[PDB]
Nucleic acid binder design. Structure first.
Ligand SMILES: [Mg+2]
Length: 78
RNA sequence: GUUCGCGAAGCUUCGUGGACAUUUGGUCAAUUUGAAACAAUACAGAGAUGAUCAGCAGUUCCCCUGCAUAAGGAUGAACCGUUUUACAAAGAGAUUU
């Protein structure tokens, strides 16, 4: 099992290396093939449970989130 | 077209008023682009445990075969990994006011 895992990891790194090599060309990372209608847990958001609308509700939270996300764009860029 | 009445020409023929009968079918339109699977090649490859092997379950936002609430599917599939805080009390030494 461990060996299999290791192999998988190796494969993944190889893939990454390949993409790095062919970076000047536009390249997309291959997704794990689905077996019987599953979720790719990047998109969609998985089975979300609510924030639960409370009494002392303030709208700065959204702003904060946006701010947080701004930084990650920068990271992506670099 | 059927016909039951009226009006003109020669029971036969035209012109009319009515009655009869009355709204089908499509969640679909014919080849690639609205989603079938096996197969094949290559590559590995078989539950515990030292090894070999049986069977049963269990969890799941995985299913298949099965008439099935039988039974069977690699022990049917994935589970084998990650694992640092409701965290306080006492003692000793050090820098800052
Ligand atoms: Mg068996």
């Amino acid at each position: 099992k461990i060996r299999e895992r290791m192999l998988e990891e190796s494969k993944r790194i190889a893939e990454l290396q390949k993409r790095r090599e062919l970076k000047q060309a536009g390249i997309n990372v291959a997704i794990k093939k689905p077996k019987k209608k599953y979720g790719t847990d990047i998109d969609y958001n998985e089975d979300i449970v609510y924030e639960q609308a409370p009494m002392p509700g303030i709208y700065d939270t959204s702003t904060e989130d946006r701010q947080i996300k701004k930084k990650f764009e920068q990271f992506e860029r670099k």
